[PDB]
């Protein structure tokens, strides 16, 4: 069945316990979250941009993480389901290198996750998020936007940054599940991939992309 298309190459070699949340979830230790979250800056600390927008390092829990465009990733490096965001959340499963779905839990060395993304409406999704084998959240998408501006607090925008550039909307710059610097798409594995969002509030929202209406739940802070 289609659960067999989940790459399940998981190895808790760092002794964190992270595989528990794939089952008996609700045990997260949020003590280190304030230190991790202090590395994320509110949008107001970035420089205003202007001029024509063109297309362009870690901590994927910050909204302003600037990802690389999605490609094809070996299934041996993935643990659990891959979610991509249209912005509505969709699951991408294992295939062979030619795109035929495969049903061996990603254990075959030819198995891959073809995440190659082109922004909707002409494409498939804005970005993707998954967990790698040792429990680190990985994300890809966009590519994010260079909005101009001067100084060392210049913003590569991977979400809706309207306040810093009028044209840097999510349709233009979205690169993953961050709808705005304060909101990310809610989905069954959000708490596993983004555990420090545990206390975010859940809002019913609507987004329009090329005139297609998306009704989704957003988790906001």
């Amino acid at each position: 069945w289609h659960i067999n298309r989940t790459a399940l190459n998981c190895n808790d070699s760092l002794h964190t316990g992270f595989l528990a949340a794939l089952f008996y979830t609700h045990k997260f230790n949020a003590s280190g979250c304030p230190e991790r979250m202090a590395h994320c800056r509110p949008i107001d600390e970035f420089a205003q941009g202007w001029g024509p927008i063109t297309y362009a390092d870690q901590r994927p829990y910050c909204w302003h993480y600037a990802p690389r465009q999605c490609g094809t990733i070996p299934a041996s490096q993935v643990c659990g389901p891959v979610y991509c965001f249209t912005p509505s959340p969709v699951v991408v499963g294992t295939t062979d290198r030619f795109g035929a779905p495969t049903y061996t839990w990603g254990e075959n060395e030819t198995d891959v996750l073809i995440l190659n993304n082109t922004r909707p409406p002409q494409g498939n999704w804005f970005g993707c998020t998954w967990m790698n084998s040792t429990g680190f959240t990985k994300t890809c998408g966009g590519p994010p936007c260079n909005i101009g501006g001067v100084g060392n607090n210049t913003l590569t925008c991977p979400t809706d940054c309207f306040r810093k550039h009028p044209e840097a909307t999510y349709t233009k710059c979205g690169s993953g599940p961050w709808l705005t610097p304060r909101c990310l798409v809610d989905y069954p594995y959000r708490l596993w991939h983004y555990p420090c969002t545990v206390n975010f509030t859940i809002f019913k929202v609507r987004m329009y992309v090329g005139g297609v209406e998306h009704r989704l739940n957003a988790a906001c802070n």
């Epitope: 998981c10 808790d12 964190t16 316990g17 992270f18 528990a20 089952f23 045990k27 997260f28």
Partner: antibody
Framework: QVQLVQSGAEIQKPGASVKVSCRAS????????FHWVRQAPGQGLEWMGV????????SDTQKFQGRLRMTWDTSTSTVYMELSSLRSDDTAVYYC??????????????????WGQGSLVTVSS | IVLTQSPGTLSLSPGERATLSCRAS???????LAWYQQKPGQAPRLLVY???TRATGIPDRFSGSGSGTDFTLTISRLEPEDFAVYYC?????????FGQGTKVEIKR
């Protein structure tokens, strides 16, 4: 990085009680089961009981009925083992043990075991 | 579930291969058979879990195999630090039980 930190060595008279503690540390997701196993000088390993932190549910062996009491303090992530009416042959190193998922392969995941460093309890007059 | 280890004492030289057996009275899933090393005065050190999965940090020369009622721990090339007591351990049934130990000593 998971480390189970037990309390230090203890000496008690026969008939008394001892309370051994085991503090969970370094977890990102805290395990739900803690077992106690003991090893007397020069002997093998013997399972005593288990506490489930979710329920407070405890299961023990009938060799220690009435004397063994296991509790969980959720605010300090510390499990306690209390053994009452001590006899000299309760002299042993007492270990807390907590299973944890180590890896997955072909749709099924497999538990490994994190061990505390042991607590020596010596019972003597 | 009684676990019976054999032999009680293995007298080998460094570089030789060691093979330790564990036999259970009833059947246990591979899923829940662990092997430990224990040195005098120290705590048991986990070597393999799930019968055949080496714990992280454990050198490659240690490997576990078997299923059902019969399980094996192999050290391919004994090193000086490997002479110790070894225990098997079934944890499939919440009432855990352990083997009685195999001592691996130096032959001379």
């Amino acid at each position: 990085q998971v480390q189970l930190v037990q309390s230090g060595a203890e000496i008690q008279k026969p008939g008394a009680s001892v309370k051994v503690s085991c503090r969970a540390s370094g977890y990102t997701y805290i395990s739900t089961s803690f077992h106690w196993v003991r090893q007397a000088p020069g002997q093998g390993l013997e399972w005593m009981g288990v506490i489930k932190t979710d329920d407070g549910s405890t299961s023990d062996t009938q060799k220690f009925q009435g004397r063994l009491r296991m509790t969980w303090d959720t605010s300090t992530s510390t499990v306690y083992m209390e053994l009452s009416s001590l006899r000299s042959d309760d002299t042993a190193v007492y270990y807390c043990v907590s299973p944890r998922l180590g890896h997955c392969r072909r749709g099924r995941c497999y538990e490994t075991l994190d061990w505390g460093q042991g607590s020596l309890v010596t019972v003597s007059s | 579930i009684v676990l019976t280890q054999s032999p009680g004492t293995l007298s080998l030289s460094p570089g030789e291969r060691a093979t330790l057996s564990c036999r259970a009275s009833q059947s246990v899933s591979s899923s829940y058979l662990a092997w430990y090393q224990q040195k005098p005065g120290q705590a048991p050190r986990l070597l393999v879990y799930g019968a055949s999965t080496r714990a992280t940090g454990i050198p490659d020369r240690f490997s576990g195999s078997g299923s059902g009622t019969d399980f094996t721990l192999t050290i391919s090339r004994l090193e000086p630090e490997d002479f110790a007591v070894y225990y098997c351990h079934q944890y499939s049934s919440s009432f855990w039980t352990f083997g009685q130990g195999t001592k691996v000593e130096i032959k001379r």
